[PDB]
Amino acid sequence: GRPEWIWLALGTALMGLGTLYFLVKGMGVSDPDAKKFYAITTLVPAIAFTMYLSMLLGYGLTMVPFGGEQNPIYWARYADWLFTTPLLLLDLALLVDADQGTILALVGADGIMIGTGLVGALTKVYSYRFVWWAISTAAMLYILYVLVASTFKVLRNVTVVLWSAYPVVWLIGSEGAGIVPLNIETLLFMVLDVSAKVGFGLILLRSRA
Amino acid sequence: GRPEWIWLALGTALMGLGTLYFLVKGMGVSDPDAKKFYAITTLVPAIAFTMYLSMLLGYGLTMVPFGGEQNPIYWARYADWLFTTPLLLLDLALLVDADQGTILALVGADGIMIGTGLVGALTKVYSYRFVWWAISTAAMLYILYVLVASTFKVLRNVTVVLWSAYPVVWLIGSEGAGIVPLNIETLLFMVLDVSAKVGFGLILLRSRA
Amino acid sequence: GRPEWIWLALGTALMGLGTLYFLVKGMGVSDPDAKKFYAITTLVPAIAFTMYLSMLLGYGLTMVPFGGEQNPIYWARYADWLFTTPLLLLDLALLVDADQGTILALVGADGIMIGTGLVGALTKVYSYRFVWWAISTAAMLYILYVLVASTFKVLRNVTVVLWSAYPVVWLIGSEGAGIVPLNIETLLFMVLDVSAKVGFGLILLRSRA
Ligand SMILES: *C/C=C(C)/C=C/C=C(C)/C=C/C1=C(C)CCCC1(C)C
Ligand SMILES: *C/C=C(C)/C=C/C=C(C)/C=C/C1=C(C)CCCC1(C)C
Ligand SMILES: *C/C=C(C)/C=C/C=C(C)/C=C/C1=C(C)CCCC1(C)C
Ligand SMILES: CCCCCCC
Ligand SMILES: CCCCCCC
Ligand SMILES: CCCCCCC
């Protein structure tokens, strides 16, 4: 129906598969610590799965009026990111044994980041979308700024790299400037999401930290 | 007005009453541990009270189009369950001193469970409602799978038993197949809710664990 | 456009400024404890900033039908208060080293307080708005009831005093009786909000507790 359906069906399948893989691997885990990393890392694609599926079916899609057009906005991504991004930071934070003080900074900057992104997404005055983008981007840079040694270091690098593309994709995509069509937009986010969650989780869960 | 009002007024009264009872009983509690069980167990009907009331008044009711009809859906139940179900699992988890790792699995599976139930409830393609039902049901079975010795054992049994009816009621009720009318549906959930919260709480709070 | 814009622009600027001040001051903080108070206290105006801005721009404003009129309701305040009020109680609670049991009572009573306030705000039957007001007010009195020695004592007093005006303002404002216009209403909340967050935070962060 919608040309981007194939990328949504595919992300659904890969988050679906990735969840099951992590579930099965986390069986045989007595370790308090590993228990924690496993619950976190399996929850991330499990949530992604549900929101890829809601997008695949018409549910996590709405039409937002701006620039003289009704524009198709996938709101379900923010509902995913709202929980999946703090869990990933929490994976990193527990890894290096961050202070409560620092987790709350990361987690709270993270909610502001995707909170303001959602507002950007649904804002009906074109110009103001970019104000909300700018604010969310500044909350992202705070997180990067704030962001065993070896796998943390690797995981942080992957994070810094993949997370940074998201505002770039949103900015040039249908949420922002409309220069890259929803189609390739949805592919781009698909590859990003699977790498930041299943990829990130493979790295983390097969590692000894 | 609506034939099911009497069951909503009644659940409101019983959650209202149950909250006050637990409040009054929790006075004279110096114990850190008991403090924790009391705050949890009193919060559960206090939230239920507000959502029984929002349903009683027209607020937590919307009309969802599917199957060629506009169908009356009580969305306020999910807003209740979203917080009340993790608190009940938390009562059980603290009881047996579960790992952080395991609480996060329970709590996160619980949010997916009622998260997907809400989507099921509001989904406008009849067939897809049942996909969302199936996913939520599978998250429920995970929780049951994951789920002093004596009161835990009793409390777990009550939980396993009453929680399992909910998807059955939803499936045959107005959310699903429309074979049991909203009326008796609302009665059924009423009895279930009061038993899983006030009943569960009586058992737990009068016990010595 | 809207006469109350000047108070929204102003609250935006002061929450904006207050956030930056606290950020800059929290640099050079190695202390686990102070780390915690700083993350909490900086998050509070950072969130307020975003919701003052959403209100300034048309976003956090909706029209609710009651009393034969469509009434302008600023829903974005509840989205602010939902997170900012538990963080402030958490500042107080950590200050005096409250039990987990007591934090959960405070935090959960706090969510019910602003939860029911939101319902009040959007309720389309005039009379019922005041039922929801009454319930939220009773959850507030519970919190006050439940609510180093010196700065706690000072901070508690400020809290008791400023928080208590909010239901008074809502009751006489456009949410309730419509006796005080939105204009002065927005000014009143503006002064209250800046005092309860930036004022409260100055007191707390310059203090040695
Ligand atoms: C699994 C999903 C991941 C790791 C997604 C991360 C998303 C972000 C870092 C999003 C950032 C955004 C901005 C900085 C502004 C524009 C809107 C967003 C939400 C795309
Ligand atoms: C106090 C309320 C309780 C304990 C409610 C528990 C509710 C559930 C276990 C609901 C489960 C559902 C499914 C498994 C799928 C269909 C939708 C739900 C949300 C009714
Ligand atoms: C920074 C913001 C603060 C401290 C706001 C606090 C708000 C309240 C204590 C609000 C209380 C309300 C009622 C008790 C009933 C009417 C609705 C509210 C939400 C204004
Ligand atoms: C949106 C993620 C924050 C939820 C935390 C409430 C304690
Ligand atoms: C919906 C229950 C989860 C809220 C947790 C955020 C930390
Ligand atoms: C609304 C504040 C509560 C979020 C807590 C979920 C654990």
Author numbering:
A (entry chain A), B (entry chain A), C (entry chain A): 6 to 152, 167 to 228
Sentences from the paper on this structure:
Here, an automated procedure is described to identify the positions of many cryocooled crystals mounted on the same sample holder, to rapidly predict and rank their relative diffraction strengths and to collect partial X-ray diffraction data sets from as many of the crystals as desired. Subsequent hierarchical cluster analysis then allows the best combination of partial data sets, optimizing the quality of the final data set obtained. To demonstrate the general applicability of the workflow described here, we have applied it to various systems and scenarios in which many crystals of the same type are mounted on the same cryocooled sample holder. In all of the cases presented our workflow has yielded data sets that are fit for purpose.
For BR1 the initial mesh scan was carried out using a Gaussian X-ray beam of 20 µm in diameter with a flux of 3 × 1011 photons s−1.
